[PDB]
Amino acid sequence: ERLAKEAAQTAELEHKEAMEMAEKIARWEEWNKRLEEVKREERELLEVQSVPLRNYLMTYVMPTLMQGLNECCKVRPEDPVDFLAEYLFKNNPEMQ
């Protein structure tokens, strides 16, 4: 009977190890998923890095920047910088 209880002890210990393995594998799979999010960010970095500065600024910033500048001019504010910065903070949350 003692030997049978020893076998139960080791069986449950090894089932604990199987649980810990299943957790470790789930952790590793989530770790690979996270890494794939990181490699997505890597691809985005490569995409931006591809673009020489003139073109990168022109495409990404200038249309939005031009539009906001136009609206700031229509404001003729006491400070363009403050208005434009706030305007961008409001717009870009929607505007891409």
Binding site: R27, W28, W31, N32, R34, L35, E37, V38, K39, E41, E42, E44, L45, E47, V48, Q49, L53, Y56, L57, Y60, V61, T64, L65, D79, V81, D82, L84, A85, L88, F89, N92, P93, Q96
Partner: protein, 97 residues
């Protein structure tokens, strides 16, 4: 804008490039404003520093994590904090946060 964009070539995680760069530039404009309320300028400066560190997360996490899985507890001390930070930013407002 010229200094901010050219030097940083910015992007922040999860955002579009456009979103990251525009928002960063607008903050940078506020932070250096010749007549912006200066304690508020330094507040934006602090946020900008955090944004920079968060962009640094991209490079750190990509360089440190290989495609092969590697021993979790032998990851560098900051590594897991930085990962947790990235993951949280996925579900945080970038404007305030």
């Amino acid at each position: 804008a010229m200094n901010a964009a050219g030097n940083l070539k910015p992007k922040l995680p999860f955002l579009s490039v456009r979103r990251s760069v525009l928002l960063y530039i607008a903050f940078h404009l506020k932070a250096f404003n010749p007549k912006g309320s200066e304690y508020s300028r330094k507040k934006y400066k602090k946020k900008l520093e955090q944004f920079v560190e968060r962009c640094e997360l991209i490079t750190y996490l990509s360089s440190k994590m290989t495609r092969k899985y590697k021993e979790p507890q032998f990851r560098a001390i900051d590594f897991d904090h930085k990962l947790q930070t990235f993951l949280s930013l996925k579900n945080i407002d970038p404007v305030t946060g």
